[PDB]
From a paper:
A large number of double-stranded DNA viruses, including tailed bacteriophages and herpes viruses, use a homomeric ring ATPase to processively translocate viral genomic DNA into procapsids during assembly. By contrast, pac systems feature imprecise, sequence-independent cleavage of the DNA concatemer during head filling, giving rise to variable genome lengths inside virus particles. Both systems encode a large terminase (TerL) protein, composed of a viral packaging ATPase domain and a nuclease domain, and a small terminase (TerS) protein, which recognises the cos or pac site between genome copies and, upon binding of DNA, recruits TerL to make an initiating DNA cut. Here, we reconstituted in vitro a cos packaging system based on bacteriophage HK97 and provided a detailed biochemical and structural description. Crystal structures of the large terminase and DNA-recruiting small terminase, a first for a biochemically defined cos system, reveal mechanistic similarities between cos and pac systems.
By size exclusion chromatography with multi-angle laser-light scattering (SEC-MALS) and native mass spectrometry, the HK97 TerS measured 160.5 kDa and 165.020 ± 0.005 kDa, respectively, in mass, corresponding to an oligomer of nine 18.3-kDa subunits. By X-ray crystallography, we determined the structure of the protein to 1.4 Å resolution. The protein crystallized with three subunits in the asymmetric unit around a crystallographic 3-fold axis, ultimately forming a 9-subunit circular oligomer, in agreement with the biophysical measurements. Of the 161 residues in each protein chain, residues 21–124 had well-resolved electron density. The N-terminal region superposes loosely with the α2 and α3 helices of the helix-turn-helix (HTH) motif of pac phage SF6 GP1 (73), the winged HTH domain of cos phage lambda gpNu1 (74), and the N-terminal HTH motif of cos phage PaP3 TerS. Two strong helix-breaking proline residues, P28 and P29, prevent an α1 helix from forming in the HK97 protein. Following the N-terminal region, two long helices form the basis of oligomerization for the HK97 TerS oligomer. The HK97 oligomer has a van der Waals outer diameter of roughly 85 Å, with an inner tunnel 55 Å long and 18 Å wide at its narrowest point. Residues K36, K37, R47, K77 and K81 form a positive belt around the outside of the complex. However, positive charges from R86, K96, K100, R107 and R114 also line the inner tunnel, which is solvent-exposed and almost wide enough to accommodate double-stranded DNA.
Residue numbers in the entry:
A (entry chain B), D (entry chain B), I (entry chain B): 23 to 124
B (entry chain C), F (entry chain C), G (entry chain C): 24 to 124
C (entry chain A), E (entry chain A), H (entry chain A): 21 to 124
The structure:
């Protein structure tokens, strides 16, 4: 009663569900249009994905010597920053950035 | 409660549920023919993210010599670029939240 | 022209298959607000909208190819070309005042 | 009586003339300064040139097999987009974009 | 949580050593103005602030190396990564309304 | 009805008709010495587009082994960059249409 | 008349005089804990410019075969990027001049 | 200085041939509105305006060369350097409030 | 009495001192915060450094034949432009750009 189910067609990853519900609960339930719900799937999927990439990054950072892959480490660092910046834009698009909600 | 997509614009069949969600997010009488064309591309992009994510997750499950790090990197970026484009497409159609709330 | 539209300027080279896109755009603001300059710009808008469908067909063909003949570089380039067309179209809509903010 | 001749020194291509006159007729004749007329030559030349590049592109796209030039196709696609974006800026500079005229 | 802060959302994966950064940020606007969405965003802010200190340690280690084993490329990349994190953090602060313009 | 260009700025001789067109597009008394320097570069750029287009068209007429696709690509871009610069130069001088209309 | 830096943020010891100068440039009661974290990075960057300039000047004094033009170029750019970042960091903290004057 | 201008600051290194550019710029806003900081900035503006003429001379020389000694790369680089100077000069004018919007 | 000493820790280069004092004298002495003084060191250092790089550039430009280094010439030209653009931002940050002072 205090949230909204994700649209099935949009492919919310199951592990993104706790992120999804946090975002839905950050503005009035009646202000979520069907279009907004589609966009919110991608926000939640991105927030989940940062945690996945950070795990990969930390794994690669623990490797020392010949098998260490500096290129992959560099790429993962950048991918995380790009996701973070995208998420800020996604929040603003949904009016769940702080300026709107606070 | 909705509008049929313009045939010439080539809405992908699996993009239909995305299409209808977007059409239902502003008043039916505010959809111009130009807007309907733009909305086909929005829906096609929203569908396509799901397609590229499926490809990405497949590549991520591959371990060892056949794993393709370059392809993984390229797919990650393609998804981000689609997402950013979709935000612009929503604003162009006035179905971003600032307009509809 | 039909009484609810405008013919495209011949010199601008509207593609035949772009015609249904053209008419959709023309019909999205008042007929009397289309200047001759705007009509030139609208040809390029319609041509771009058509061209996305053409590139998507090429892309889907390339995506169905598996094994040695698959061309990952071409697939990457087509994905980007479609996004660049889409973004250009948004600017072209705004330039013509047929984006939603203007019309709705 | 309803248009203006292009400045000879500016090098309007002859096939760009129908584009030129369309643009001149899109704001009041008395609002065309000599500076604007120079700028309008380049607008018209660019609008013509898109049609030229599209013809080249379509020619290259019809070629299949060993002689197909994917690099040239990619370059022409980008050149057309860059011209289109430039033309939007050129229209705004001349106040013949729709916001000004409509 | 302590009565002047908020627990981080477990699913977001706040790093243990990011906790003191987390609490500093939470305590920089009213507790009741933290939406669940904001709390997710704040995890990434805190994780980034921690990560700068980690990268700076790696950088300083590489800078102490002289001769054949010195890796100028890695040093260059780490310098840039730190600047990119710093710039991202400024955007993350503004998104949360904990930049100075909002709070002061 | 016009102003002589500052000699030190090196207005190209064939840029003169461009120069005078620009000078005549705002009040003569509003041309500061600084503006006159900037206007030399505007006129020189407007002339130079015509020069580069002549080179480009020459290269485009060449077919076969001597055709230089790289040079053609570079000239196309140089022209676009000049055009975009000219728009900025017009705005800097307040001879863009928004100012003069 | 000042505030201690948060230990977890890793203010470099030689950055301390920079830190205190920045803290003293707006009211003490307007420094939130979040601002104090951001100010550590500002001070660390201000210190680091001096470090990179020392390295740059050392490389510039080298003549002949051991001179490293690539390193010189990279250091020049790193300094400019730090400087630009610092301007953004000042604005974020409202210690740029527009805010404090 | 002549009574309608200001001497350049010696430490800033105004090029001798940049002097006529310098004086044109100084004379484009009130003498009393030139701060010492502005005078430093104006040295760089004048030096850039002079330098365009220098680069254009080099470019025209290279453009007259035909055959094996022609250096297309250098020609390309000089064209871009001139455009970058021109764009920088517009920003330098605005920074000094001697762009037309300010003065006219 | 009409200027301010630079903060020692900030590493103002000695040859940048005349630039420093010119900038300090371009707004009211009481409006220079300690933070502004740090920033002003980097402004002055950059203004000095343009003169240094121009000297290097002119030296390289006088070299003809096999020893001429076109890459270095290109890099120095760009470095000067980047410094100049940075200085404009540094002036605005300190409110000693003309819009603020005039």
């Amino acid at each position: 009663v205090d949230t909204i189910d994700p649209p099935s067609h949009a492919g919310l990853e199951k592990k993104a569900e706790p992120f999804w519900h946090d975002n839905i609960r950050s503005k009035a339930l009646d202000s979520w249009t069907p279009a907004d719900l589609l966009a919110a799937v991608e926000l939640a999927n991105n927030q989940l994905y940062i945690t996945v990439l950070r795990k990969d990054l930390r794994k690669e950072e623990r490797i020392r010597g010949e098998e260490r892959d500096e290129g992959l480490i560099k790429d993962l660092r950048k991918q995380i920053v790009e996701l973070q910046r995208t998420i800020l834009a996604q929040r603003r698009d949904l009016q769940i950035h702080s300026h709107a909600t606070n």
